[PDB]
Design an enzyme around this catalytic site. Sequence first.
Site, PDB file in Angstrom:
ATOM      1  N   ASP A   1      19.284  33.951  72.845  1.00 11.92           N
ATOM      2  CA  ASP A   1      17.844  34.186  72.866  1.00 11.92           C
ATOM      3  C   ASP A   1      17.083  33.890  74.020  1.00 11.92           C
ATOM      4  O   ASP A   1      16.641  32.639  74.376  1.00 11.92           O
ATOM      5  CB  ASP A   1      17.131  33.451  71.738  1.00 11.92           C
ATOM      6  CG  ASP A   1      15.743  33.184  71.388  1.00 11.92           C
ATOM      7  OD1 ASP A   1      15.081  34.285  72.013  1.00 11.92           O
ATOM      8  OD2 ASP A   1      15.565  32.234  70.731  1.00 11.92           O
TER       9      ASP A   1
ATOM     10  N   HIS B   1      18.005  26.334  79.872  1.00 12.38           N
ATOM     11  CA  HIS B   1      18.175  27.672  80.218  1.00 12.38           C
ATOM     12  C   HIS B   1      17.943  27.512  81.658  1.00 12.38           C
ATOM     13  O   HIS B   1      17.270  26.956  82.313  1.00 12.38           O
ATOM     14  CB  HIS B   1      17.411  28.629  79.404  1.00 12.38           C
ATOM     15  CG  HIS B   1      18.154  29.110  78.208  1.00 12.38           C
ATOM     16  ND1 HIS B   1      19.218  30.245  78.556  1.00 12.38           N
ATOM     17  CD2 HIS B   1      17.801  29.188  77.253  1.00 12.38           C
ATOM     18  CE1 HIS B   1      19.360  30.777  77.165  1.00 12.38           C
ATOM     19  NE2 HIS B   1      18.836  30.106  76.428  1.00 12.38           N
TER      20      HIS B   1
ATOM     21  N   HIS C   1      23.230  28.854  77.018  1.00 10.12           N
ATOM     22  CA  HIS C   1      24.645  28.865  76.422  1.00 10.12           C
ATOM     23  C   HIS C   1      25.500  29.636  77.040  1.00 10.12           C
ATOM     24  O   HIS C   1      25.955  30.704  76.679  1.00 10.12           O
ATOM     25  CB  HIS C   1      24.265  29.603  74.783  1.00 10.12           C
ATOM     26  CG  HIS C   1      23.245  29.152  73.998  1.00 10.12           C
ATOM     27  ND1 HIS C   1      22.959  27.804  73.299  1.00 10.12           N
ATOM     28  CD2 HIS C   1      21.776  29.573  73.718  1.00 10.12           C
ATOM     29  CE1 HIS C   1      22.058  27.585  72.664  1.00 10.12           C
ATOM     30  NE2 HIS C   1      21.358  28.606  72.784  1.00 10.12           N
TER      31      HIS C   1
ATOM     32  N   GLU D   1      28.057  34.559  72.439  1.00 17.25           N
ATOM     33  CA  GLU D   1      27.026  34.073  71.423  1.00 17.25           C
ATOM     34  C   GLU D   1      27.097  35.850  70.895  1.00 17.25           C
ATOM     35  O   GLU D   1      26.681  36.723  71.505  1.00 17.25           O
ATOM     36  CB  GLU D   1      25.400  33.972  71.958  1.00 17.25           C
ATOM     37  CG  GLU D   1      24.469  34.036  70.801  1.00 17.25           C
ATOM     38  CD  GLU D   1      23.272  33.176  70.934  1.00 17.25           C
ATOM     39  OE1 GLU D   1      23.145  32.421  71.807  1.00 17.25           O
ATOM     40  OE2 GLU D   1      22.348  33.291  70.062  1.00 17.25           O
TER      41      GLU D   1
ATOM     42  N   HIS E   1      25.116  36.386  67.876  1.00 17.76           N
ATOM     43  CA  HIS E   1      24.090  36.240  66.671  1.00 17.76           C
ATOM     44  C   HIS E   1      23.628  37.574  66.177  1.00 17.76           C
ATOM     45  O   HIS E   1      23.437  37.286  64.656  1.00 17.76           O
ATOM     46  CB  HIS E   1      22.997  35.361  67.518  1.00 17.76           C
ATOM     47  CG  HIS E   1      22.137  34.817  66.568  1.00 17.76           C
ATOM     48  ND1 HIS E   1      20.955  33.835  66.952  1.00 17.76           N
ATOM     49  CD2 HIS E   1      21.781  34.679  65.332  1.00 17.76           C
ATOM     50  CE1 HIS E   1      20.277  33.195  65.870  1.00 17.76           C
ATOM     51  NE2 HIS E   1      21.077  33.799  64.817  1.00 17.76           N
TER      52      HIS E   1
ATOM     53  N   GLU F   1      25.852  30.418  68.221  1.00 19.13           N
ATOM     54  CA  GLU F   1      25.633  31.130  67.064  1.00 19.13           C
ATOM     55  C   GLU F   1      26.477  32.324  67.188  1.00 19.13           C
ATOM     56  O   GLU F   1      26.011  33.731  67.387  1.00 19.13           O
ATOM     57  CB  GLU F   1      24.194  31.380  67.244  1.00 19.13           C
ATOM     58  CG  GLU F   1      23.299  30.346  67.254  1.00 19.13           C
ATOM     59  CD  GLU F   1      21.674  30.860  67.202  1.00 19.13           C
ATOM     60  OE1 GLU F   1      21.198  31.339  68.111  1.00 19.13           O
ATOM     61  OE2 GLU F   1      21.106  30.254  66.214  1.00 19.13           O
TER      62      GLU F   1
ATOM     63  N   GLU G   1      20.883  21.037  68.838  1.00 18.75           N
ATOM     64  CA  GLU G   1      19.466  21.561  68.986  1.00 18.75           C
ATOM     65  C   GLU G   1      18.509  21.010  67.799  1.00 18.75           C
ATOM     66  O   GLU G   1      18.676  20.884  66.759  1.00 18.75           O
ATOM     67  CB  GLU G   1      19.322  23.095  68.786  1.00 18.75           C
ATOM     68  CG  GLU G   1      20.088  23.724  70.104  1.00 18.75           C
ATOM     69  CD  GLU G   1      19.973  25.216  69.689  1.00 18.75           C
ATOM     70  OE1 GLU G   1      19.003  25.756  69.085  1.00 18.75           O
ATOM     71  OE2 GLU G   1      20.825  26.043  70.052  1.00 18.75           O
TER      72      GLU G   1
ATOM     73  N   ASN H   1      10.571  43.563  70.222  1.00 24.74           N
ATOM     74  CA  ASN H   1      10.696  42.248  71.231  1.00 24.74           C
ATOM     75  C   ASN H   1      10.111  41.203  70.182  1.00 24.74           C
ATOM     76  O   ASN H   1       9.630  41.507  68.992  1.00 24.74           O
ATOM     77  CB  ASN H   1       9.858  42.476  72.280  1.00 24.74           C
ATOM     78  CG  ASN H   1       8.221  42.277  71.991  1.00 24.74           C
ATOM     79  OD1 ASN H   1       7.907  41.176  71.520  1.00 24.74           O
ATOM     80  ND2 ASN H   1       7.583  43.594  71.799  1.00 24.74           N
TER      81      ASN H   1
ATOM     82  N   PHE I   1       8.523  33.852  71.125  1.00 23.23           N
ATOM     83  CA  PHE I   1       9.164  33.024  70.531  1.00 23.23           C
ATOM     84  C   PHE I   1      10.235  32.692  71.771  1.00 23.23           C
ATOM     85  O   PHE I   1      11.208  32.036  71.554  1.00 23.23           O
ATOM     86  CB  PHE I   1      10.111  33.672  69.511  1.00 23.23           C
ATOM     87  CG  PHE I   1      10.944  32.819  68.831  1.00 23.23           C
ATOM     88  CD1 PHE I   1      10.490  31.937  67.934  1.00 23.23           C
ATOM     89  CD2 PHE I   1      12.726  32.900  68.779  1.00 23.23           C
ATOM     90  CE1 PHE I   1      11.136  30.994  67.306  1.00 23.23           C
ATOM     91  CE2 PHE I   1      13.047  31.680  67.928  1.00 23.23           C
ATOM     92  CZ  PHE I   1      12.450  30.882  67.353  1.00 23.23           C
TER      93      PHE I   1
ATOM     94  N   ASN J   1       9.481  28.058  74.167  1.00 24.67           N
ATOM     95  CA  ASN J   1       9.949  26.869  73.390  1.00 24.67           C
ATOM     96  C   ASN J   1      10.032  25.367  74.195  1.00 24.67           C
ATOM     97  O   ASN J   1      10.582  24.507  73.678  1.00 24.67           O
ATOM     98  CB  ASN J   1      11.200  27.078  72.354  1.00 24.67           C
ATOM     99  CG  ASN J   1      11.313  28.488  72.165  1.00 24.67           C
ATOM    100  OD1 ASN J   1      12.310  28.954  72.358  1.00 24.67           O
ATOM    101  ND2 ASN J   1      10.203  29.038  71.409  1.00 24.67           N
TER     102      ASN J   1
END
Lengths: 1011, 210
Positions: free
Chosen positions: A189, A345, A379, A404, A406, A449, A525, A585, A589, A592
């Site tokens: 993400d 990140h 990640h 990942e 996801h 994930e 998390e 998109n 989000f 964070n």
Amino acid sequence: RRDWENPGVTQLNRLAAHPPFASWRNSEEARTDRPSQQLRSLNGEWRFAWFPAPEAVPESWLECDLPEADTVVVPSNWQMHGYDAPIYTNVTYPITVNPPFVPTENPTGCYSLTFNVDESWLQEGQTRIIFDGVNSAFHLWCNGRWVGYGQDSRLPSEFDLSAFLRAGENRLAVMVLRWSDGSYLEDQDMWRMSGIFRDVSLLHKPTTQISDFHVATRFNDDFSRAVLEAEVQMCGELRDYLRVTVSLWQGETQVASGTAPFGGEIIDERGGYADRVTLRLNVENPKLWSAEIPNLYRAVVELHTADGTLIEAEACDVGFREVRIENGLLLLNGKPLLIRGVNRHEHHPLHGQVMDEQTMVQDILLMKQNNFNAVRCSHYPNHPLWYTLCDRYGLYVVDEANIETHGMVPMNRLTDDPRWLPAMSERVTRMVQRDRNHPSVIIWSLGNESGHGANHDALYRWIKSVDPSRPVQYEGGGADTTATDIICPMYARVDEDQPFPAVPKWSIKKWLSLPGETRPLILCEYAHAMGNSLGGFAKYWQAFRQYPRLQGGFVWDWVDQSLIKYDENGNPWSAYGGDFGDTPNDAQFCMNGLVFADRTPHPALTEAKHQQQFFQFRLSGQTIEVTSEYLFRHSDNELLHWMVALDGKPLASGEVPLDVAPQGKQLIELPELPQPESAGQLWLTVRVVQPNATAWSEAGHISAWQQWRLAENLSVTLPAASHAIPHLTTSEMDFCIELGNKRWQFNRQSGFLSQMWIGDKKQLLTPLRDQFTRAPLDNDIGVSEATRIDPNAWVERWKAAGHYQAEAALLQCTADTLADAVLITTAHAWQHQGKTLFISRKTYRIDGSGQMAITVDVEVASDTPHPARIGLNCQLAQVAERVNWLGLGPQENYPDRLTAACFDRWDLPLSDMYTPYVFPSENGLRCGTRELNYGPHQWRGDFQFNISRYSQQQLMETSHRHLLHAEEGTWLNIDGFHMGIGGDDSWSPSVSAEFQLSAGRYHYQLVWCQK
Amino acid sequence: GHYQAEAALLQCTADTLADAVLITTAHAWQHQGKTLFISRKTYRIDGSGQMAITVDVEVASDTPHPARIGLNCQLAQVAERVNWLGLGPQENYPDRLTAACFDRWDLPLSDMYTPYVFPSENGLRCGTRELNYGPHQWRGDFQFNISRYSQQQLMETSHRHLLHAEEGTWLNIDGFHMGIGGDDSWSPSVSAEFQLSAGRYHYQLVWCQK
Ligand SMILES: O=C1O[C@H](CO)[C@H](O)[C@H](O)[C@H]1O
Ligand SMILES: [Mg+2]
Ligand SMILES: [Mg+2]
Ligand code: NA
Ligand code: NA
Ligand code: NA
Ligand code: NA
Ligand code: NA
């Protein structure tokens, strides 16, 4: 062959992974870790040409530079140069899900570079090129000759160029593909970018070289003795004269040393490794490494002839520490850890995913300054420098494989497929082979994930096999599968269960005791910091401290993934998903973090710093009990500063030296405090100050604090007698009250205070009205995918209930003249489609002193979604420079996020009363306020408030902070009650019941007067 | 000194409104020169014969949380039935009221008293919106207990058989009442959420002709 669409080919002619090499040819240089002439950097100006697909690249480019190409800097992400758009998608893959195929139109970046090579490098030894990071796959050519291929964007790819180079000028040609089968394993993400985003270097090794080396440290029961074992591997000409010497240094003092010839012990029927040797060095009373005290030793590995000729030397920082799980607890050097971590990140608002030392240092200093002691590489493996920095400054690290998936359905479709095991194993094995010597890394992570597949189990075991010194964790498939040594859920709540089918997120307290469970629990998390968030953060830390096996977690996350864009005037503004034409998109989000992209803190950072304090306090009479949560260090750079103030007025103060052993206690009795004269509440405030600067903080740094209400003397004295008596003037349209130069006007049609006059000037731009809503916070919107609109989200419930459209209906508005005042009584009912949502009954008592007492009583229908707030608002006509108040502060604080704030007298510029969240929402609130001062106005009582140039309406209708425009006058929101903000996650209702305004009937009173 | 506290008047005024009389009062409870609680009220009697009582109380943060925050009086009348709209029919308290149900309950006055062998506060009923006794009616959102025994007598008598019905009927109407606890009976056991620690409380009652 389209190797970028074959999960079976993840590389071609790539060299084996290994720990960081510099190939020093002088031991002293290796010891001091000074630059190495054998290690050159190729970062700088390169040539670059963009193409819609690889089939578009002209053959000429391989031999000669392209005229159409431009000169750009490397490392860099080509989206940051504008060649194409960066895409921000969360779960849904940026390409059609048709593994292992990628779009025919595959953005291709052709990098090329002309560089020099000293003949000395080609006359002996081996010359290789190293690409620390290429997103996501690439082919390499040197002087027109194809060299190799590589995948996995977060680990170095190395190639031998010895037979391709020529003395003098040489030309590299790198064709980087944006999409490849490797993309299927890179669905994290974040912003999807591409290019050569990490360092490119040239290394020279002797033909007879150190090809790999592992360092381990074992201890006796009380850590008073240790054995450092160093396994060293070599390549090339194996001879009896060869030797390896591993010496250990503490500063300039050699504490240990061992020399030996090659030829490991016998391991099986065929013998042993003749190309390997293991040195064992005894170290008495070693200085142990930890985030508290990052003690390091320097290990130098020398490859040489028995008679004294150094062939080459390698080296690393050694941290003596033991990481093990015992009886259900994660232990560091024998002590149970309390992980105060955060997910981080690699993001930069200007350079994208390219990291630099200054940014890394800034992050670490900020993290440690805010009481964090751990970080998770979400990640993927990070830039090599990150680990060195974490080793030296002291931060526990969770190194995570770049895996990942996801977007797959189900999430484990590829991880449970043996045909994907090869690509996955390389992402795990090469990581371990690269970072296994860093003391900062205490836990390996199999990725993020990707559900739970057999491949995870296979790789889990592979790591336990090759490196038994570090626990292995993985959250996928339920957070407690056979592929993890640690129960590592994400967003599992403290007391509330979320019984999702197959992968339930149990209450963390309950998770630990499920039948048969014994493992420790550390959330990978938790406490999603999206916008105005971190409500309920204190609840996690109370549990972490009460439950031995609840050992912490990593907040999500460190920094907003926002990118800088420019307007027509060339002014910068923060952009997020969709701001680059990228679609689909997931909008905002991607933001964070606890801090803004430029590293400016968000209000929530202080809440984190407070709850993560390393000193706990308790008060009993005149005694302050200080407890240390440090496991290893003594409080040798801390002093306690205390202060007792009466309603913001300093009465006494002082400081006491802190001398508490780790896990110990210290009692501090405060002097005989003088009984105050005035009435009011006495407040005790203590803070831990670090007198001396450190490698991570300046002198005077405040690391902890706590407040306590002391004695209180209620005011029983009646105010002086009023001279005059307010006069009432009536008209069909209004009730006007006059007292000297002050005037109040109540509209008889609306039933609200529509104007006030202080002297000769009006004070209101908008009438004082009830407010039961707020510009929705990201947690109120509750969405993690710009396509899913949860009707269960608070904002959706308020919208459907009509809270934002309900209109006030006047039920009563009367005026009364009393002996020494005028009384205005009003009653309103807010309704939506014949449904009465709220009822507000008020009285305004204006007496001879010039004060207006506003008593408000509200009824909220029990069946309407609980309201965001219960208060009043209006737009003052004036704009003042300062805001003064007696309450919780100085920073923004909400009901479920106010433990960090302190009660006192605060004074800030208006601007500081507005928090610049990139996605605008209700903000800047301050709670527990007994008095508010703005311009000539003063409000008293017990309320929450926010003050700024932006109305809830504008905040609500604006998507970006840079699009906001200061409105005339000042908007004031004074609440008797405000809903919690939540944040356990931002995609579902997360405000705890105790912070929901469900009482049905509310009461609050304010006194408005002139200052 | 909660059992010693003395009401000291701070204010008592009267005002005539368009259709009612407003009595405003303010009291302070002190002990050893310490103000424990401050009670501010207004009484509004309208033409319909209804008395609206609004009460706002301040509790000094440094004094132990009070057992209750309400009003009490001894009514001259002695009716045989007690009717109310709220939680019941049996005695229930803040931290022990999940079993009681909201509805219209009517019981004989005796049933409104629980005969614990060792006398103490008892018979309370919470979440009550309407209480009826004889010619009296009380409306609001309160808890209450009603019986022939004063808190003073209950507090001074060791055995229930020694209790004597007093003249009239003692009424205790609380805007708030502290939890009873019970995790054990030899140490503080009332959970924090059931302790009256807010500092500032508010409640409203309407007294009128039944
Ligand atoms: O579960 C998650 O939640 C975060 C939401 O911001 C982010 O997507 C993380 O990468 C993912 O592991
Ligand atoms: Mg491939
Ligand atoms: Mg994800
Ligand atoms: Na714990
Ligand atoms: Na996110
Ligand atoms: Na000290
Ligand atoms: Na908005
Ligand atoms: Na008794």
